[PDB]
Amino acid sequence: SKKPRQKRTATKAYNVTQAFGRRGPEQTQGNFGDQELIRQGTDYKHWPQIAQFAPSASAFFGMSRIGMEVTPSGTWLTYTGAIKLDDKDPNFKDQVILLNKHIDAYKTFP
Amino acid sequence: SKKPRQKRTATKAYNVTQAFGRRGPEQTQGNFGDQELIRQGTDYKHWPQIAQFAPSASAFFGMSRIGMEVTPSGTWLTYTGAIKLDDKDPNFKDQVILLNKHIDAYKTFP
Protein backbone atom coordinates (compact mmCIF):
# COMPACT_ATOMS: atom_id res chain seq x y z
CA SER A 1 0.00 0.00 0.00
CA LYS A 2 3.16 2.07 -0.31
CA LYS A 3 3.17 2.31 -4.09
CA PRO A 4 1.42 4.99 -6.14
CA ARG A 5 -2.05 3.78 -7.08
CA GLN A 6 -1.21 3.43 -10.78
CA LYS A 7 1.67 1.02 -10.04
CA ARG A 8 -0.18 -1.32 -7.66
CA THR A 9 -0.78 -4.98 -8.50
CA ALA A 10 -3.90 -6.62 -7.10
CA THR A 11 -3.54 -10.18 -5.79
CA LYS A 12 -5.52 -12.39 -3.43
CA ALA A 13 -3.51 -10.98 -0.51
CA TYR A 14 -4.10 -7.37 -1.69
CA ASN A 15 -7.28 -7.47 -3.74
CA VAL A 16 -8.94 -5.12 -6.23
CA THR A 17 -10.95 -3.41 -3.49
CA GLN A 18 -7.93 -2.94 -1.22
CA ALA A 19 -5.73 -1.63 -4.05
CA PHE A 20 -8.19 0.36 -6.19
CA GLY A 21 -11.30 0.90 -4.05
CA ARG A 22 -14.84 -0.40 -4.31
CA ARG A 23 -16.33 -0.80 -7.77
CA GLY A 24 -19.08 1.67 -8.55
CA PRO A 25 -20.73 4.11 -10.95
CA GLU A 26 -18.99 7.38 -10.07
CA GLN A 27 -16.99 9.40 -12.59
CA THR A 28 -13.46 8.44 -11.51
CA GLN A 29 -14.39 5.19 -9.73
CA GLY A 30 -13.44 1.84 -11.23
CA ASN A 31 -16.29 -0.29 -12.57
CA PHE A 32 -14.48 -3.42 -13.78
CA GLY A 33 -14.56 -6.81 -12.08
CA ASP A 34 -16.95 -9.52 -10.94
CA GLN A 35 -16.70 -11.05 -7.48
CA GLU A 36 -14.08 -13.60 -8.58
CA LEU A 37 -11.74 -11.04 -10.18
CA ILE A 38 -12.25 -8.56 -7.33
CA ARG A 39 -11.05 -11.06 -4.73
CA GLN A 40 -8.23 -12.50 -6.87
CA GLY A 41 -6.70 -9.64 -8.88
CA THR A 42 -3.83 -10.88 -11.02
CA ASP A 43 -4.25 -14.34 -9.46
CA TYR A 44 -7.46 -14.64 -11.51
CA LYS A 45 -6.92 -17.72 -13.65
CA HIS A 46 -8.04 -15.90 -16.82
CA TRP A 47 -6.05 -12.75 -16.04
CA PRO A 48 -3.80 -13.16 -19.14
CA GLN A 49 -6.89 -12.94 -21.37
CA ILE A 50 -7.77 -9.61 -19.71
CA ALA A 51 -4.23 -8.22 -19.51
CA GLN A 52 -3.77 -8.69 -23.27
CA PHE A 53 -5.85 -5.51 -23.64
CA ALA A 54 -3.94 -3.43 -21.09
CA PRO A 55 -1.61 -0.87 -22.70
CA SER A 56 2.13 -0.64 -22.40
CA ALA A 57 3.46 2.58 -20.90
CA SER A 58 4.37 3.76 -24.40
CA ALA A 59 0.91 2.93 -25.76
CA PHE A 60 -0.84 4.52 -22.77
CA PHE A 61 0.80 7.85 -23.58
CA GLY A 62 0.73 7.29 -27.34
CA MET A 63 -2.92 6.33 -27.78
CA SER A 64 -4.74 8.22 -25.05
CA ARG A 65 -6.05 11.75 -24.77
CA ILE A 66 -4.08 13.12 -21.82
CA GLY A 67 -5.00 16.12 -19.71
CA MET A 68 -4.20 17.70 -16.38
CA GLU A 69 -6.73 19.03 -13.89
CA VAL A 70 -5.95 21.09 -10.81
CA THR A 71 -8.72 20.57 -8.30
CA PRO A 72 -8.31 21.05 -4.52
CA SER A 73 -7.98 17.31 -4.04
CA GLY A 74 -4.71 17.91 -5.92
CA THR A 75 -3.32 17.72 -9.44
CA TRP A 76 -4.72 14.93 -11.61
CA LEU A 77 -3.57 13.44 -14.90
CA THR A 78 -6.69 12.53 -16.88
CA TYR A 79 -6.79 9.90 -19.60
CA THR A 80 -9.32 8.58 -22.11
CA GLY A 81 -8.96 6.21 -25.03
CA ALA A 82 -10.18 3.13 -26.83
CA ILE A 83 -8.52 -0.16 -27.75
CA LYS A 84 -9.79 -2.08 -30.77
CA LEU A 85 -10.44 -5.80 -30.47
CA ASP A 86 -9.34 -8.02 -33.36
CA ASP A 87 -12.57 -9.34 -34.83
CA LYS A 88 -10.48 -11.68 -37.03
CA ASP A 89 -9.07 -13.44 -33.96
CA PRO A 90 -10.77 -16.85 -33.61
CA ASN A 91 -10.97 -16.06 -29.87
CA PHE A 92 -12.81 -12.76 -30.50
CA LYS A 93 -16.21 -13.94 -29.26
CA ASP A 94 -14.72 -15.25 -26.00
CA GLN A 95 -12.85 -11.96 -25.55
CA VAL A 96 -16.07 -9.94 -25.74
CA ILE A 97 -17.74 -12.37 -23.32
CA LEU A 98 -14.91 -12.13 -20.79
CA LEU A 99 -14.78 -8.33 -20.86
CA ASN A 100 -18.57 -8.01 -20.61
CA LYS A 101 -18.54 -10.41 -17.65
CA HIS A 102 -16.59 -7.85 -15.60
CA ILE A 103 -17.89 -4.50 -16.90
CA ASP A 104 -20.41 -3.14 -14.37
CA ALA A 105 -20.63 -6.57 -12.71
CA TYR A 106 -20.76 -4.86 -9.29
CA LYS A 107 -24.38 -3.86 -9.99
CA THR A 108 -25.54 -7.42 -9.27
CA PHE A 109 -23.99 -7.93 -5.82
CA PRO A 110 -23.43 -5.91 -2.61
CA SER B 1 4.36 -3.47 -36.57
CA LYS B 2 2.19 -6.59 -36.28
CA LYS B 3 1.76 -6.34 -32.50
CA PRO B 4 -1.63 -5.08 -31.28
CA ARG B 5 -1.58 -1.31 -30.95
CA GLN B 6 -1.89 -1.38 -27.15
CA LYS B 7 1.24 -3.56 -26.83
CA ARG B 8 3.54 -1.49 -29.06
CA THR B 9 6.64 0.21 -27.66
CA ALA B 10 7.78 3.38 -29.41
CA THR B 11 11.54 3.81 -29.90
CA LYS B 12 13.74 5.89 -32.18
CA ALA B 13 13.59 3.03 -34.71
CA TYR B 14 9.76 2.78 -34.45
CA ASN B 15 8.59 6.19 -33.31
CA VAL B 16 5.36 7.50 -31.78
CA THR B 17 3.93 8.52 -35.15
CA GLN B 18 4.69 5.12 -36.68
CA ALA B 19 3.32 3.19 -33.71
CA PHE B 20 0.38 5.37 -32.67
CA GLY B 21 -0.33 7.90 -35.44
CA ARG B 22 0.21 11.63 -35.56
CA ARG B 23 -0.91 13.76 -32.63
CA GLY B 24 -4.15 15.63 -33.16
CA PRO B 25 -7.37 17.04 -31.70
CA GLU B 26 -9.86 14.30 -32.60
CA GLN B 27 -11.12 11.95 -29.91
CA THR B 28 -9.61 8.94 -31.72
CA GLN B 29 -6.13 10.52 -31.83
CA GLY B 30 -3.51 10.81 -29.14
CA ASN B 31 -2.54 14.33 -28.11
CA PHE B 32 0.57 13.71 -25.99
CA GLY B 33 4.16 14.43 -26.97
CA ASP B 34 6.42 17.18 -28.27
CA GLN B 35 8.64 16.62 -31.31
CA GLU B 36 11.47 15.12 -29.24
CA LEU B 37 9.26 12.55 -27.49
CA ILE B 38 7.53 11.66 -30.77
CA ARG B 39 10.92 11.06 -32.40
CA GLN B 40 12.39 9.06 -29.51
CA GLY B 41 9.53 7.19 -27.84
CA THR B 42 10.84 5.27 -24.84
CA ASP B 43 14.36 6.47 -25.76
CA TYR B 44 13.28 10.00 -24.77
CA LYS B 45 15.55 11.46 -22.09
CA HIS B 46 12.61 12.07 -19.73
CA TRP B 47 10.70 8.86 -20.47
CA PRO B 48 11.08 7.46 -16.90
CA GLN B 49 9.47 10.61 -15.49
CA ILE B 50 6.55 10.10 -17.88
CA ALA B 51 6.24 6.32 -17.44
CA GLN B 52 5.89 6.72 -13.66
CA PHE B 53 2.29 7.77 -14.36
CA ALA B 54 1.45 4.90 -16.72
CA PRO B 55 -0.73 2.25 -15.06
CA SER B 56 0.10 -1.37 -14.50
CA ALA B 57 -2.21 -3.87 -16.16
CA SER B 58 -3.86 -4.43 -12.78
CA ALA B 59 -4.23 -0.68 -12.19
CA PHE B 60 -5.50 -0.06 -15.73
CA PHE B 61 -8.42 -2.41 -15.12
CA GLY B 62 -8.72 -1.51 -11.43
CA MET B 63 -8.81 2.28 -11.68
CA SER B 64 -10.44 2.94 -15.04
CA ARG B 65 -14.04 3.16 -16.12
CA ILE B 66 -14.17 0.40 -18.75
CA GLY B 67 -16.74 0.07 -21.52
CA MET B 68 -17.41 -1.75 -24.77
CA GLU B 69 -18.62 0.02 -27.91
CA VAL B 70 -19.48 -1.43 -31.32
CA THR B 71 -18.79 1.09 -34.09
CA PRO B 72 -18.62 0.67 -37.90
CA SER B 73 -14.84 0.25 -37.53
CA GLY B 74 -15.09 -2.57 -34.98
CA THR B 75 -15.54 -3.43 -31.31
CA TRP B 76 -13.67 -1.15 -28.91
CA LEU B 77 -12.66 -1.42 -25.26
CA THR B 78 -13.07 2.12 -23.92
CA TYR B 79 -11.24 3.48 -20.88
CA THR B 80 -11.27 6.71 -18.85
CA GLY B 81 -9.73 7.70 -15.54
CA ALA B 82 -7.65 10.11 -13.50
CA ILE B 83 -4.29 9.60 -11.77
CA LYS B 84 -3.35 11.87 -8.88
CA LEU B 85 0.11 13.40 -8.71
CA ASP B 86 1.88 13.41 -5.34
CA ASP B 87 2.05 16.99 -4.05
CA LYS B 88 4.51 15.73 -1.40
CA ASP B 89 6.92 14.47 -4.08
CA PRO B 90 9.95 16.81 -4.27
CA ASN B 91 9.79 16.34 -8.06
CA PHE B 92 6.16 17.54 -8.26
CA LYS B 93 6.92 20.89 -9.89
CA ASP B 94 9.24 19.29 -12.45
CA GLN B 95 6.45 16.81 -13.18
CA VAL B 96 3.95 19.60 -13.91
CA ILE B 97 6.50 21.26 -16.21
CA LEU B 98 7.14 17.99 -18.06
CA LEU B 99 3.45 17.20 -18.56
CA ASN B 100 2.74 20.78 -19.68
CA LYS B 101 5.43 20.44 -22.35
CA HIS B 102 3.84 17.39 -23.96
CA ILE B 103 0.07 17.81 -23.55
CA ASP B 104 -1.24 19.25 -26.84
CA ALA B 105 2.33 20.11 -27.90
CA TYR B 106 1.41 19.31 -31.52
CA LYS B 107 -0.61 22.55 -31.68
CA THR B 108 2.61 24.55 -32.13
CA PHE B 109 4.43 22.18 -34.50
CA PRO B 110 5.69 23.80 -37.74
Side-chain angles (χ1 to χ4, degrees):
Chain A
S1 322
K2 332 194 198 112
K3 298 207 301 212
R5 188 173 185 243
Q6 67 268 24
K7 296 303 187 182
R8 295 171 187 175
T9 303
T11 64
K12 293 171 312 234
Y14 183 52
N15 63 40
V16 173
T17 295
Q18 302 174 257
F20 310 117
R22 268 198 130 172
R23 329 285 79 212
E26 307 303 325
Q27 280 185 240
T28 58
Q29 183 180 22
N31 71 329
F32 191 89
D34 72 2
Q35 291 183 96
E36 189 183 13
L37 175 58
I38 285 167
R39 65 186 169 88
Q40 293 176 349
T42 58
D43 297 313
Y44 189 64
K45 284 324 281 203
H46 287 93
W47 181 252
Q49 286 71 230
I50 297 171
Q52 73 180 312
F53 300 110
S56 65
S58 185
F60 180 79
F61 279 99
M63 303 182 310
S64 309
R65 301 208 53 83
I66 303 295
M68 174 143 56
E69 297 181 343
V70 182
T71 83
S73 45
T75 297
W76 298 79
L77 192 73
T78 64
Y79 62 92
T80 65
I83 292 164
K84 198 183 86 170
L85 273 66
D86 189 353
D87 62 329
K88 285 332 111 180
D89 193 326
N91 308 320
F92 170 77
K93 283 174 153 203
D94 295 330
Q95 289 162 4
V96 175
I97 292 173
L98 172 55
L99 291 165
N100 282 333
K101 184 145 82 154
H102 298 288
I103 291 173
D104 288 341
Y106 76 92
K107 294 186 176 182
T108 67
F109 51 85
Chain B
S1 34
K2 313 114 71 183
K3 273 193 302 232
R5 188 170 183 246
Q6 71 271 20
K7 295 304 187 185
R8 297 173 183 170
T9 302
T11 62
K12 205 211 182 222
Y14 183 52
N15 65 44
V16 171
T17 303
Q18 301 176 273
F20 309 116
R22 75 156 56 252
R23 326 280 88 202
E26 310 298 330
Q27 290 300 312
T28 61
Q29 297 176 298
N31 69 329
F32 189 90
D34 73 2
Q35 291 175 78
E36 191 179 9
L37 171 58
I38 289 168
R39 193 172 71 251
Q40 304 271 339
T42 62
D43 299 313
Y44 177 56
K45 64 182 184 179
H46 293 298
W47 182 253
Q49 293 74 48
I50 292 168
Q52 71 181 317
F53 300 112
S56 72
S58 194
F60 177 81
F61 282 101
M63 302 182 309
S64 293
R65 295 207 59 80
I66 300 296
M68 184 129 300
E69 302 294 332
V70 176
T71 69
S73 64
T75 298
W76 296 82
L77 191 58
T78 65
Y79 61 90
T80 67
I83 293 169
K84 197 185 80 170
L85 277 67
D86 192 344
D87 65 329
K88 305 320 171 342
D89 195 314
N91 300 315
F92 175 88
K93 295 184 224 166
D94 290 330
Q95 290 163 9
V96 172
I97 294 287
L98 182 57
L99 279 315
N100 270 342
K101 187 191 301 99
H102 295 286
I103 294 173
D104 290 336
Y106 75 93
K107 288 182 175 179
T108 61
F109 287 179

PDB file of all heavy atoms in Angstrom, chain B residues 4 24 32 50 58 65 74 79-80 88 90 92 97 103 108:
ATOM      1  N   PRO B   4      -0.452  -5.919 -31.539  1.00  0.00           N
ATOM      2  CA  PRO B   4      -1.628  -5.084 -31.281  1.00  0.00           C
ATOM      3  C   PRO B   4      -1.201  -3.710 -30.789  1.00  0.00           C
ATOM      4  O   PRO B   4      -0.207  -3.566 -30.074  1.00  0.00           O
ATOM      5  CB  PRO B   4      -2.382  -5.857 -30.192  1.00  0.00           C
ATOM      6  CG  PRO B   4      -1.903  -7.266 -30.321  1.00  0.00           C
ATOM      7  CD  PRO B   4      -0.477  -7.174 -30.770  1.00  0.00           C
ATOM      8  N   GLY B  24      -3.101  14.803 -32.635  1.00  0.00           N
ATOM      9  CA  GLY B  24      -4.153  15.634 -33.163  1.00  0.00           C
ATOM     10  C   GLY B  24      -5.275  15.881 -32.177  1.00  0.00           C
ATOM     11  O   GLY B  24      -5.266  15.382 -31.046  1.00  0.00           O
ATOM     12  N   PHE B  32      -0.547  13.551 -26.911  1.00  0.00           N
ATOM     13  CA  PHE B  32       0.568  13.706 -25.986  1.00  0.00           C
ATOM     14  C   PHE B  32       1.899  13.543 -26.709  1.00  0.00           C
ATOM     15  O   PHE B  32       2.126  12.535 -27.391  1.00  0.00           O
ATOM     16  CB  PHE B  32       0.463  12.676 -24.860  1.00  0.00           C
ATOM     17  CG  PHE B  32       1.438  12.894 -23.736  1.00  0.00           C
ATOM     18  CD1 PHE B  32       1.096  13.688 -22.651  1.00  0.00           C
ATOM     19  CD2 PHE B  32       2.683  12.284 -23.749  1.00  0.00           C
ATOM     20  CE1 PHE B  32       1.984  13.880 -21.607  1.00  0.00           C
ATOM     21  CE2 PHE B  32       3.577  12.472 -22.709  1.00  0.00           C
ATOM     22  CZ  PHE B  32       3.227  13.271 -21.636  1.00  0.00           C
ATOM     23  N   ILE B  50       7.883  10.236 -17.317  1.00  0.00           N
ATOM     24  CA  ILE B  50       6.546  10.096 -17.880  1.00  0.00           C
ATOM     25  C   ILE B  50       5.949   8.748 -17.500  1.00  0.00           C
ATOM     26  O   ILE B  50       4.803   8.662 -17.038  1.00  0.00           O
ATOM     27  CB  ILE B  50       6.597  10.289 -19.407  1.00  0.00           C
ATOM     28  CG1 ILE B  50       6.932  11.743 -19.749  1.00  0.00           C
ATOM     29  CG2 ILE B  50       5.285   9.858 -20.052  1.00  0.00           C
ATOM     30  CD1 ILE B  50       7.294  11.956 -21.203  1.00  0.00           C
ATOM     31  N   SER B  58      -2.910  -4.368 -13.882  1.00  0.00           N
ATOM     32  CA  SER B  58      -3.862  -4.428 -12.778  1.00  0.00           C
ATOM     33  C   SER B  58      -4.502  -3.071 -12.517  1.00  0.00           C
ATOM     34  O   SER B  58      -5.723  -2.973 -12.350  1.00  0.00           O
ATOM     35  CB  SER B  58      -3.155  -4.928 -11.519  1.00  0.00           C
ATOM     36  OG  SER B  58      -4.093  -5.297 -10.526  1.00  0.00           O
ATOM     37  N   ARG B  65     -12.690   3.497 -15.699  1.00  0.00           N
ATOM     38  CA  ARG B  65     -14.040   3.164 -16.124  1.00  0.00           C
ATOM     39  C   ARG B  65     -13.930   2.502 -17.491  1.00  0.00           C
ATOM     40  O   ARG B  65     -13.442   3.114 -18.448  1.00  0.00           O
ATOM     41  CB  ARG B  65     -14.924   4.409 -16.174  1.00  0.00           C
ATOM     42  CG  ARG B  65     -15.149   5.036 -14.803  1.00  0.00           C
ATOM     43  CD  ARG B  65     -16.454   5.808 -14.725  1.00  0.00           C
ATOM     44  NE  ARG B  65     -17.614   4.970 -15.002  1.00  0.00           N
ATOM     45  CZ  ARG B  65     -18.173   4.142 -14.123  1.00  0.00           C
ATOM     46  NH1 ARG B  65     -17.677   4.027 -12.898  1.00  0.00           N
ATOM     47  NH2 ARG B  65     -19.227   3.422 -14.477  1.00  0.00           N
ATOM     48  N   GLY B  74     -15.313  -1.346 -35.724  1.00  0.00           N
ATOM     49  CA  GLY B  74     -15.089  -2.568 -34.976  1.00  0.00           C
ATOM     50  C   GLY B  74     -15.629  -2.458 -33.562  1.00  0.00           C
ATOM     51  O   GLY B  74     -16.432  -1.583 -33.253  1.00  0.00           O
ATOM     52  N   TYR B  79     -11.790   3.273 -22.209  1.00  0.00           N
ATOM     53  CA  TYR B  79     -11.241   3.482 -20.875  1.00  0.00           C
ATOM     54  C   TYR B  79     -11.128   4.973 -20.584  1.00  0.00           C
ATOM     55  O   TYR B  79     -10.777   5.761 -21.467  1.00  0.00           O
ATOM     56  CB  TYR B  79      -9.875   2.800 -20.706  1.00  0.00           C
ATOM     57  CG  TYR B  79      -8.788   3.300 -21.641  1.00  0.00           C
ATOM     58  CD1 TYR B  79      -7.959   4.359 -21.280  1.00  0.00           C
ATOM     59  CD2 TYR B  79      -8.575   2.696 -22.872  1.00  0.00           C
ATOM     60  CE1 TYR B  79      -6.963   4.811 -22.131  1.00  0.00           C
ATOM     61  CE2 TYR B  79      -7.581   3.139 -23.727  1.00  0.00           C
ATOM     62  CZ  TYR B  79      -6.780   4.195 -23.350  1.00  0.00           C
ATOM     63  OH  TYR B  79      -5.793   4.631 -24.206  1.00  0.00           O
ATOM     64  N   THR B  80     -11.444   5.347 -19.343  1.00  0.00           N
ATOM     65  CA  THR B  80     -11.267   6.706 -18.848  1.00  0.00           C
ATOM     66  C   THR B  80     -10.836   6.633 -17.389  1.00  0.00           C
ATOM     67  O   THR B  80     -11.150   5.668 -16.686  1.00  0.00           O
ATOM     68  CB  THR B  80     -12.560   7.545 -18.928  1.00  0.00           C
ATOM     69  OG1 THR B  80     -13.534   7.022 -18.016  1.00  0.00           O
ATOM     70  CG2 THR B  80     -13.148   7.543 -20.333  1.00  0.00           C
ATOM     71  N   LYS B  88       3.392  15.885  -2.322  1.00  0.00           N
ATOM     72  CA  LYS B  88       4.510  15.729  -1.403  1.00  0.00           C
ATOM     73  C   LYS B  88       5.801  15.328  -2.105  1.00  0.00           C
ATOM     74  O   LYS B  88       6.872  15.430  -1.496  1.00  0.00           O
ATOM     75  CB  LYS B  88       4.174  14.667  -0.350  1.00  0.00           C
ATOM     76  CG  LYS B  88       2.890  14.910   0.439  1.00  0.00           C
ATOM     77  CD  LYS B  88       2.691  16.371   0.806  1.00  0.00           C
ATOM     78  CE  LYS B  88       1.305  16.603   1.394  1.00  0.00           C
ATOM     79  NZ  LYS B  88       0.363  15.496   1.065  1.00  0.00           N
ATOM     80  N   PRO B  90       9.076  15.658  -3.967  1.00  0.00           N
ATOM     81  CA  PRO B  90       9.950  16.805  -4.267  1.00  0.00           C
ATOM     82  C   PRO B  90      10.090  17.096  -5.751  1.00  0.00           C
ATOM     83  O   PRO B  90      10.519  18.199  -6.113  1.00  0.00           O
ATOM     84  CB  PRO B  90      11.292  16.406  -3.635  1.00  0.00           C
ATOM     85  CG  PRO B  90      11.228  14.915  -3.506  1.00  0.00           C
ATOM     86  CD  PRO B  90       9.787  14.594  -3.241  1.00  0.00           C
ATOM     87  N   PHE B  92       7.500  17.188  -7.787  1.00  0.00           N
ATOM     88  CA  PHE B  92       6.162  17.541  -8.258  1.00  0.00           C
ATOM     89  C   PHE B  92       6.203  18.661  -9.291  1.00  0.00           C
ATOM     90  O   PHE B  92       5.571  18.569 -10.348  1.00  0.00           O
ATOM     91  CB  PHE B  92       5.274  17.935  -7.075  1.00  0.00           C
ATOM     92  CG  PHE B  92       3.910  18.434  -7.477  1.00  0.00           C
ATOM     93  CD1 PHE B  92       2.861  17.549  -7.658  1.00  0.00           C
ATOM     94  CD2 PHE B  92       3.677  19.788  -7.668  1.00  0.00           C
ATOM     95  CE1 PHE B  92       1.607  18.003  -8.025  1.00  0.00           C
ATOM     96  CE2 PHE B  92       2.428  20.247  -8.039  1.00  0.00           C
ATOM     97  CZ  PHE B  92       1.391  19.354  -8.217  1.00  0.00           C
ATOM     98  N   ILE B  97       5.819  20.661 -15.063  1.00  0.00           N
ATOM     99  CA  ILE B  97       6.495  21.260 -16.212  1.00  0.00           C
ATOM    100  C   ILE B  97       6.604  20.256 -17.352  1.00  0.00           C
ATOM    101  O   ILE B  97       6.360  20.586 -18.520  1.00  0.00           O
ATOM    102  CB  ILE B  97       7.877  21.798 -15.793  1.00  0.00           C
ATOM    103  CG1 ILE B  97       7.724  22.955 -14.807  1.00  0.00           C
ATOM    104  CG2 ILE B  97       8.680  22.228 -17.014  1.00  0.00           C
ATOM    105  CD1 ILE B  97       7.233  24.225 -15.442  1.00  0.00           C
ATOM    106  N   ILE B 103       1.511  17.816 -23.321  1.00  0.00           N
ATOM    107  CA  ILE B 103       0.071  17.808 -23.550  1.00  0.00           C
ATOM    108  C   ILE B 103      -0.267  18.848 -24.610  1.00  0.00           C
ATOM    109  O   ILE B 103      -0.012  20.044 -24.429  1.00  0.00           O
ATOM    110  CB  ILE B 103      -0.694  18.066 -22.248  1.00  0.00           C
ATOM    111  CG1 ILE B 103      -0.477  16.910 -21.269  1.00  0.00           C
ATOM    112  CG2 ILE B 103      -2.174  18.256 -22.541  1.00  0.00           C
ATOM    113  CD1 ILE B 103      -1.061  17.162 -19.896  1.00  0.00           C
ATOM    114  N   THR B 108       1.613  23.577 -31.720  1.00  0.00           N
ATOM    115  CA  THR B 108       2.614  24.554 -32.129  1.00  0.00           C
ATOM    116  C   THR B 108       3.673  23.973 -33.058  1.00  0.00           C
ATOM    117  O   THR B 108       4.683  24.636 -33.315  1.00  0.00           O
ATOM    118  CB  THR B 108       3.270  25.205 -30.908  1.00  0.00           C
ATOM    119  OG1 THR B 108       3.923  24.200 -30.123  1.00  0.00           O
ATOM    120  CG2 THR B 108       2.227  25.916 -30.057  1.00  0.00           C
TER     121      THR B 108
END
